[PDB]
Design an enzyme around this catalytic site. Structure first.
Site, PDB file in Angstrom:
ATOM      1  N   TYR A 116       3.934  10.269   0.431  1.00 17.99           N
ATOM      2  CA  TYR A 116       5.026   9.832   1.308  1.00 17.99           C
ATOM      3  C   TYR A 116       6.372  10.075   0.638  1.00 17.99           C
ATOM      4  O   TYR A 116       7.421   9.922   1.261  1.00 17.99           O
ATOM      5  CB  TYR A 116       4.880   8.355   1.666  1.00 17.99           C
ATOM      6  CG  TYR A 116       3.595   8.047   2.387  1.00 17.99           C
ATOM      7  CD1 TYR A 116       3.182   8.827   3.464  1.00 17.99           C
ATOM      8  CD2 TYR A 116       2.789   6.999   1.992  1.00 17.99           C
ATOM      9  CE1 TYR A 116       2.008   8.559   4.131  1.00 17.99           C
ATOM     10  CE2 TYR A 116       1.606   6.720   2.655  1.00 17.99           C
ATOM     11  CZ  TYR A 116       1.221   7.506   3.721  1.00 17.99           C
ATOM     12  OH  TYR A 116       0.049   7.243   4.394  1.00 17.99           O
ATOM     13  N   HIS A 138      -6.981  10.206  -2.088  1.00 11.56           N
ATOM     14  CA  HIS A 138      -6.392  10.151  -0.739  1.00 11.56           C
ATOM     15  C   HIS A 138      -7.274  10.798   0.337  1.00 11.56           C
ATOM     16  O   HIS A 138      -7.372  10.277   1.448  1.00 11.56           O
ATOM     17  CB  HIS A 138      -5.005  10.784  -0.733  1.00 11.56           C
ATOM     18  CG  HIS A 138      -4.084  10.223   0.303  1.00 11.56           C
ATOM     19  ND1 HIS A 138      -2.761   9.926   0.035  1.00 11.56           N
ATOM     20  CD2 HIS A 138      -4.282   9.922   1.607  1.00 11.56           C
ATOM     21  CE1 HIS A 138      -2.188   9.465   1.132  1.00 11.56           C
ATOM     22  NE2 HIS A 138      -3.086   9.456   2.101  1.00 11.56           N
ATOM     23  N   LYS A 140      -2.102   6.241  -4.278  1.00 14.12           N
ATOM     24  CA  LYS A 140      -3.162   7.186  -3.973  1.00 14.12           C
ATOM     25  C   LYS A 140      -2.880   8.531  -4.617  1.00 14.12           C
ATOM     26  O   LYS A 140      -1.737   9.007  -4.641  1.00 14.12           O
ATOM     27  CB  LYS A 140      -3.318   7.345  -2.460  1.00 14.12           C
ATOM     28  CG  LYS A 140      -3.225   6.044  -1.669  1.00 14.12           C
ATOM     29  CD  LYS A 140      -3.660   6.250  -0.213  1.00 14.12           C
ATOM     30  CE  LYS A 140      -3.449   4.991   0.647  1.00 14.12           C
ATOM     31  NZ  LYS A 140      -2.020   4.563   0.772  1.00 14.12           N
ATOM     32  N   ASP A 143       0.827  -1.204   0.000  1.00 14.41           N
ATOM     33  CA  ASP A 143       0.000   0.000   0.000  1.00 14.41           C
ATOM     34  C   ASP A 143       0.863   1.256   0.000  1.00 14.41           C
ATOM     35  O   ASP A 143       1.594   1.508   0.952  1.00 14.41           O
ATOM     36  CB  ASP A 143      -0.953  -0.005   1.195  1.00 14.41           C
ATOM     37  CG  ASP A 143      -1.862   1.211   1.233  1.00 14.41           C
ATOM     38  OD1 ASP A 143      -2.989   1.143   0.702  1.00 14.41           O
ATOM     39  OD2 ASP A 143      -1.463   2.242   1.808  1.00 14.41           O
TER      40      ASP A 143
END
Length: 301
Positions: A48, A110, A77, A43
């Site tokens: 990030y 997201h 996402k 995932d």
């Protein structure tokens, strides 16, 4: 046990490695360790800022483990700054470039809160306020749908959307969301939303599945009774509610421990106890978005 079947006929593995903006070099090693242990689901997220490290670790692992692309389930996402229709395609293409993939198994919106495009991931004032944007959910979704049409993405879904917001997506969509990812754990069971989402055929993924939870007495008792660890009880709890789980870790021993959750069963009484002992308080509130029309957490669920 068996992958969950989604409303489009495709399956998703009920456990995946959750990633995050961890210290440099940790995520790459986590990906490799996870895949060696047996994980077949990763995932990820643009925000990030480590999908390039993931992509490389992934490519090397498939080769050394002699695994095929189609053996792995990869989620990414779409980040808030790319919700305007004209930006969705490039953001996906960018993520796929970094992950070194030709397609994603799953691509989620997201958040329901768009942010100003064309700068930092969290565009900010000099009052420290977030620079909000206004983009209807159904308009972003139309572009998500095209990703499916084109084969860049197999399934699309939502993250941190509430019931109202999901209803609206389902009312307008040509292609239904296949998955909803939200905060779920013993200290925040999110029952009403989960029941709603499953009732309309979505699968549901628990993020922050371990949420101190590992220390709760009933959790420890139940772990002792089954001769498993607390984290293992917490994950099994979510699995038995028919959830996917994506526990985040870059620690080898934890990555391994999290995966050993398929050889025991919590009883109905144990399940009930965990529910009645819940706090239950939302851990991930992102209050800096609370001023937006579509901030998801002010409604009951």
């Amino acid at each position: 046990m068996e992958p969950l079947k989604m409303n489009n006929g495709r399956s998703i593995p009920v456990i995946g490695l959750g990633t995050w903006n961890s210290p440099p070099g940790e995520v790459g090693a986590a990906v490799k360790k996870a895949l060696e242990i047996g994980y077949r689901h990763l995932d990820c997220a643009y925000v990030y800022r480590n999908e390039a490290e993931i992509g490389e670790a992934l490519e090397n692992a498939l080769n050394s483990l002699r695994l095929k692309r189609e053996d792995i389930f990869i989620t990414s996402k779409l980040w808030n700054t790319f919700f305007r229709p004209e930006h969705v395609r490039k953001a996906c293409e960018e993520t796929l470039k970094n992950l070194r993939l030709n397609y994603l198994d799953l691509y989620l919106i997201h958040w329901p809160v768009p942010l100003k495009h064309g700068g930092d991931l969290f565009p900010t004032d000099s009052n420290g306020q977030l620079c909000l944007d206004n983009v209807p959910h159904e308009d972003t979704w139309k572009e998500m749908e095209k990703l499916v049409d084109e084969g860049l993405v197999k399934s699309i879904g939502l993250s941190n959307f509430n019931k109202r917001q999901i209803q609206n997506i389902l009312e307008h969509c040509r292609i239904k969301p296949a998955n909803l990812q939200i905060e779920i754990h013993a200290n925040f069971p999110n029952i009403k939303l989960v029941e709603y989402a499953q009732s309309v055929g979505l699968t549901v993924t628990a993020y922050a599945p371990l949420g101190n939870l590992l220390t709760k007495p009933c959790v420890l008792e139940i772990a002792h009774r089954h001769k498993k660890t607390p984290a293992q009880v917490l994950l099994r709890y979510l699995l038995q509610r028919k959830l996917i789980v994506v526990p985040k870790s870059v620690t080898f021993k934890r990555i391994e421990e999290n995966f050993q959750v398929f050889d025991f069963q919590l009883s109905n009484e144990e399940m009930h106890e965990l529910n009645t002992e819940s706090l239950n308080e939302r851990q991930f509130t992102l209050l800096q978005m609370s001023g937006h029309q579509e901030y998801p957490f002010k409604e009951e669920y």
